[PDB]
Design a protein around this motif. Structure first.
Motif, PDB file in Angstrom:
ATOM      1  N   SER A  39       0.830  -1.205   0.000  1.00 28.59           N
ATOM      2  CA  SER A  39       0.000   0.000   0.000  1.00 28.59           C
ATOM      3  C   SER A  39       0.866   1.258   0.000  1.00 28.59           C
ATOM      4  O   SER A  39       2.002   1.249   0.495  1.00 28.59           O
ATOM      5  CB  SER A  39      -0.957  -0.001   1.205  1.00 28.59           C
ATOM      6  N   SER A 127       1.239  12.019  11.613  1.00 26.40           N
ATOM      7  CA  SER A 127       0.110  12.789  12.142  1.00 26.40           C
ATOM      8  C   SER A 127       0.427  13.494  13.467  1.00 26.40           C
ATOM      9  O   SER A 127      -0.266  14.446  13.838  1.00 26.40           O
ATOM     10  CB  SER A 127      -1.143  11.920  12.266  1.00 26.40           C
ATOM     11  N   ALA A 128       1.467  13.035  14.166  1.00 31.23           N
ATOM     12  CA  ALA A 128       1.966  13.715  15.370  1.00 31.23           C
ATOM     13  C   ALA A 128       2.541  15.074  15.018  1.00 31.23           C
ATOM     14  O   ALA A 128       2.204  16.080  15.653  1.00 31.23           O
ATOM     15  CB  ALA A 128       3.028  12.867  16.064  1.00 31.23           C
ATOM     16  N   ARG A 235       7.408   3.049  10.843  1.00 31.58           N
ATOM     17  CA  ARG A 235       8.177   3.913   9.955  1.00 31.58           C
ATOM     18  C   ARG A 235       9.662   3.613  10.052  1.00 31.58           C
ATOM     19  O   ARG A 235      10.291   3.865  11.081  1.00 31.58           O
ATOM     20  CB  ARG A 235       7.928   5.388  10.277  1.00 31.58           C
TER      21      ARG A 235
HETATM   22  N1  LIG Z   1       0.679   5.137   9.360  1.00 34.27           N
HETATM   23  C1  LIG Z   1       1.017   3.822   9.170  1.00 34.27           C
HETATM   24  C2  LIG Z   1       0.984   3.184   7.946  1.00 34.27           C
HETATM   25  C3  LIG Z   1       0.583   3.800   6.650  1.00 34.27           C
HETATM   26  O1  LIG Z   1      -0.210   4.732   6.625  1.00 34.27           O
HETATM   27  N2  LIG Z   1       1.118   3.265   5.549  1.00 34.27           N
HETATM   28  C4  LIG Z   1       0.830   3.743   4.201  1.00 34.27           C
HETATM   29  C5  LIG Z   1       2.065   3.358   3.389  1.00 34.27           C
HETATM   30  C6  LIG Z   1       2.885   4.589   3.072  1.00 34.27           C
HETATM   31  O2  LIG Z   1       2.471   5.398   2.205  1.00 34.27           O
HETATM   32  O3  LIG Z   1       3.961   4.754   3.689  1.00 34.27           O
HETATM   33  C7  LIG Z   1      -0.404   3.105   3.619  1.00 34.27           C
HETATM   34  O4  LIG Z   1      -0.640   3.275   2.411  1.00 34.27           O
HETATM   35  O5  LIG Z   1      -1.163   2.428   4.348  1.00 34.27           O
HETATM   36  N3  LIG Z   1       1.389   1.920   8.195  1.00 34.27           N
HETATM   37  C8  LIG Z   1       1.652   1.822   9.524  1.00 34.27           C
HETATM   38  N4  LIG Z   1       1.439   3.000  10.134  1.00 34.27           N
HETATM   39  C9  LIG Z   1       1.607   3.212  11.597  1.00 34.27           C
HETATM   40  O6  LIG Z   1       0.637   4.115  12.128  1.00 34.27           O
HETATM   41  C10 LIG Z   1       1.179   4.776  13.270  1.00 34.27           C
HETATM   42  C11 LIG Z   1       0.662   6.207  13.283  1.00 34.27           C
HETATM   43  O7  LIG Z   1       0.869   6.784  11.995  1.00 34.27           O
HETATM   44  P1  LIG Z   1       0.548   8.322  11.679  1.00 34.27           P
HETATM   45  O8  LIG Z   1       0.501   8.395  10.179  1.00 34.27           O
HETATM   46  O9  LIG Z   1      -0.791   8.557  12.335  1.00 34.27           O
HETATM   47  O10 LIG Z   1       1.696   9.061  12.301  1.00 34.27           O
HETATM   48  C12 LIG Z   1       2.694   4.698  13.136  1.00 34.27           C
HETATM   49  O11 LIG Z   1       3.316   4.150  14.291  1.00 34.27           O
HETATM   50  C13 LIG Z   1       2.982   3.692  12.052  1.00 34.27           C
HETATM   51  O12 LIG Z   1       3.794   4.307  11.058  1.00 34.27           O
END
Ligand SMILES: Nc1c(C(=O)N[C@@H](CC(=O)O)C(=O)O)ncn1[C@@H]1O[C@H](COP(=O)(O)O)[C@@H](O)[C@@H]1O
Ligand SMILES: N[C@@H](CC(=O)O)C(=O)O
Ligand SMILES: N[C@@H](CC(=O)O)C(=O)O
Length: 299
Positions: A39, A127-128, A235
């Protein structure tokens, strides 16, 4: 590549996530199959990254073992000289099905859900950072002033979400109980800090991660469930090129991300990645796996 598992009803499907297919094996047992789906910008690509799900399965298994003396986990113990296939209906050993399942599937115990996304952030990003820029808070928690993008927090922090809306630890306690939420937050930070320290030494900064936890209530005991500290659940950043005051490249997804944006395909469904993108992205997963586990892929 395995894009979508097709088991012809031999086991019933529980769910298909972005990347994982989950099947019910019996009353107490699930089968977690990591596909090669990927994704970006919250949509799955049309085609897949060959063996990505094997690499991430093995990486998750590595972390479960690394943490085995820190936390109990949901993995079913496979007897020596046996495989997962010995624990599945005989039909799933037939070549048509075994190719879709081998090396990417984990047999897991069903436990009582803790309905929180247990996110721990060691660094301010995603998002932080977006919230912090607006109001100087992270999940409503008061933060020190003067933090720069991608900066390390003074201590890694529990910042839960609900399946996704960012919520405070106090809301987490409302949702799952005051005592449980505290135990969850404390364990998560500990597990994260240990793995983050180890990964950084290997050259990868794990900026944050999403754990899922369960509870064995017959023994009141927190269980590490779901996938663990992979580039899908966390990440990953290149540690050598780390620079505060700017965004970091995604260790695993930047090549793909760059192609999508360059073609105005970010967030678009049904997008087929070109071969060069697939190949380079795959190579990035192999490198992360080899760097973190110490094991060789293909040698
Ligand atoms: N945010 C992701 C995602 C994600 O969005 N992946 C993308 C892939 C991309 O474009 O990089 C996707 O398409 O789904 N996967 C896991 N995490 C985990 O979520 C935790 C909070 O993330 P935030 O974006 O709210 O800082 C944070 O601890 C983690 O990063
Ligand atoms: N092997 C146990 C967990 C453990 O021994 O920590 C189980 O599957 O429930
Ligand atoms: N002490 C919690 C219960 C729990 O931790 O599950 C409560 O607020 O009721």
């Amino acid at each position: 590549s395995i894009t979508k598992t097709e088991l012809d009803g031999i086991l019933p499907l529980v769910a298909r996530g972005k990347v994982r297919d989950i099947y019910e094996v019996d009353a107490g047992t699930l089968l977690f199959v990591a596909t090669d789906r990927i994704s970006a910008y919250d949509v799955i690509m049309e085609n897949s990254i060959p063996e990505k799900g094997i690499l991430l399965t093995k990486l998750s298994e590595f972390w479960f073992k690394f943490l085995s003396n820190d936390v109990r986990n949901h993995l079913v113990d496979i007897a020596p000289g046996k495989t997962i296939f010995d624990y599945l209906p005989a039909k799933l050993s037939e070549p048509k099905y075994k190719t879709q399942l081998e090396d990417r599937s984990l047999l897991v115990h069903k436990h009582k859900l803790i309905p929180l996304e247990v996110i721990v952030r060691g660094y301010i990003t995603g998002s932080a950072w977006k919230e912090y820029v607006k109001t100087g808070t992270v999940h409503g928690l008061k933060q020190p002033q003067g933090l720069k993008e991608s900066q390390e927090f003074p201590e890694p922090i529990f910042t839960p979400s609900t399946k996704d809306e960012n919520i405070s630890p106090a809301q987490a306690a409302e949702l799952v109980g005051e005592d449980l939420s505290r135990r969850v937050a404390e364990l998560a930070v500990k597990l994260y800090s240990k793995c983050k320290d180890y990964a950084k030494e290997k050259g990868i900064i794990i900026a944050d991660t999403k754990f899922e936890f369960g509870i064995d209530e017959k023994t009141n005991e927190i269980i590490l469930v779901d996938e663990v500290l992979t580039p899908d659940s966390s990440r990953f950043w290149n540690g050598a090129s780390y620079k505060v005051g700017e965004s970091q490249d995604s260790y695993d997804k930047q090549f793909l991300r760059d192609w999508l944006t360059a073609n105005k395909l970010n967030g678009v469904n049904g997008v087929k990645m070109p071969q060069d993108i697939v190949d380079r992205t795959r190579a990035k997963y192999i490198e992360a796996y080899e760097t973190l586990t110490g094991s060789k892929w293909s040698h």
